Design a binder for this molecule. Sequence first.
Ligand SMILES: O=C(Nc1nccs1)c1cccc(CN2C(=O)N(Cc3cccc(C(=O)Nc4nccs4)c3)[C@H](Cc3ccccc3)[C@H](O)[C@@H](O)[C@H]2Cc2ccccc2)c1
Lengths: 99, 99
Amino acid sequence: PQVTLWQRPLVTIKIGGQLKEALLDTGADDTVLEEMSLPGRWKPKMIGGIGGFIKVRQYDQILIEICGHKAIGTVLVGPTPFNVIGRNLLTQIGCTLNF
Amino acid sequence: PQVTLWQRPLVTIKIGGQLKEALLDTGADDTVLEEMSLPGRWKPKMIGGIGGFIKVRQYDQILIEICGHKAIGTVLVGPTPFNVIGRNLLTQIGCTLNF
Ligand SMILES: O=C(Nc1nccs1)c1cccc(CN2C(=O)N(Cc3cccc(C(=O)Nc4nccs4)c3)[C@H](Cc3ccccc3)[C@H](O)[C@@H](O)[C@H]2Cc2ccccc2)c1
């Protein structure tokens, strides 16, 4: 799709059998999701944002379908205000920025 | 131009006679820059990000050049780690997201 930026660029994702919506976020290196039951192993990590750092759990090799596109990668789950999809998954669905 | 997201999408901007680099950030509503000196009047605002909230100063009607394109808008100056251009300016240079 081509999405213009007059509104939040929100998309539907299915992760773990749950459907959420999320923001396509070009400035975020990593994908961070709000608290959610994911099965499996995870490693604690911290990321920074504006505002500070947050401790998060990192899940590797998780399948996500973002607007119907499947991709697999790392997601971080933690106290974000909003589900953000960052460049690690954006490259996989082929997402580009044009001006 | 077209920008793929394998690297952080930085552009050069010129603002208040100064050159900086900034990140193009579709997940950000507002543009927020590191502290620098801008002329004029401002007012306090408080912005939330991942990690928390920060207080910033709002300058309205600032001229920025982002790549070779000019825009005039609100700019927030404050304690970010990284200069972020948000959708309020991104819309003015006609930036789209495509997948
Ligand atoms: O990978 C990451 N970090 C890592 N650390 C180590 C390794 S990887 C990472 C992953 C996701 C997000 C971020 C951190 N992050 C944010 O904090 N903001 C808040 C933001 C930025 C700019 C403006 C606003 C804004 O307008 N906010 C408003 N609040 C009220 C009104 S408007 C908000 C949003 C996301 C957001 C929007 C709304 C609510 C909550 C969050 C941006 O869209 C993101 O790209 C990014 C920008 C950034 C990148 C690096 C360092 C600092 C800041 C970093």
